[PDB]
Amino acid sequence: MIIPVRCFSCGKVVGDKWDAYLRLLEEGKQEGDALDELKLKRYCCRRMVLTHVDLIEKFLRYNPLEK
Amino acid sequence: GVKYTCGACAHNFSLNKSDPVRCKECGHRVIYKARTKRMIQFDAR
């Protein structure tokens, strides 16, 4: 739904690296190189950013219920 | 006495248990109650 704050397995904070990851991918870097540049060594952390699906961008497209 | 919110235009209003269930300005048939004024607390766990 939205990038988790902590890696499930170990507990490293990965919630502050989603925007940087998208910026790096925008510049043409490969996914492995982008994850390496963010200093994500353990594959337990790498799966958190690699396999995250961002669904909040789909929930936000609905008109807000209040105003 | 109790607030309500329209389901389309999100317009706040109130009803007196005798008005027809309808938004006053767009005539929508579906309305929602507003959130309670009580305190809501969560354990952050």
Added chain:
Amino acid sequence: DDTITTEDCWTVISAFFEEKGLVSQQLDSFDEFMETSIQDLV
């Protein structure tokens, strides 16, 4: 010419799913029923 690989097969399958969809049979059957079947039943 040139040989056909597996990726070309997946391109063709992608075209199939782009046109048809996954529930095309239900919609096609209902459209057939509404367009012509009711009139013939009458």
Added chain:
Amino acid sequence: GNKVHIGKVPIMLRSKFCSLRTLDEVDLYKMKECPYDMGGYFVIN
């Protein structure tokens, strides 16, 4: 003798006679319909 009303036939969603066949992508959100919904079912009661 003219158009006499004989009944109401339920409409399969996303079919040719459904209101959602048109409306593109943007209006599908305003109607609170999921663009991932595929149709193919009826809505009875």
Added chain:
Amino acid sequence: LAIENLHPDDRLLLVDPSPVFFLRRPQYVSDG
């Protein structure tokens, strides 16, 4: 220019101190 435009002998100088068909690059919109 890129690695392809490099001379083959100079490419041979790039030695690690080939793609495989079953490692896709991840996507987000898919298709259909």
Added chain:
Amino acid sequence: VVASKASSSMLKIDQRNKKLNNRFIRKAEMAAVEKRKLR
């Protein structure tokens, strides 16, 4: 629509990745099939 910046970036990444996959996977398959043929 006025799509958000993240969605536009994701769309660009998806287009690039689709092109790169369509090239590299096909090239690898062509490389493998000829080797399997000559064996």
Added chain:
Amino acid sequence: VAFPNQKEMVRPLFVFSDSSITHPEFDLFLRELDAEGLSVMDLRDVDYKYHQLKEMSSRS
């Protein structure tokens, strides 16, 4: 609407202010009415207006 001293005016609704009428404002209105030679609304008529507004606001 119309000021007593001034002439008739057609105004939109938002021109009025939610703030209450002050003592000098009502005094000036009374002085303008006296200058024109007009009177103030009767207390019976004031009650009739109050009842009309209460009926209209609480109507279903």
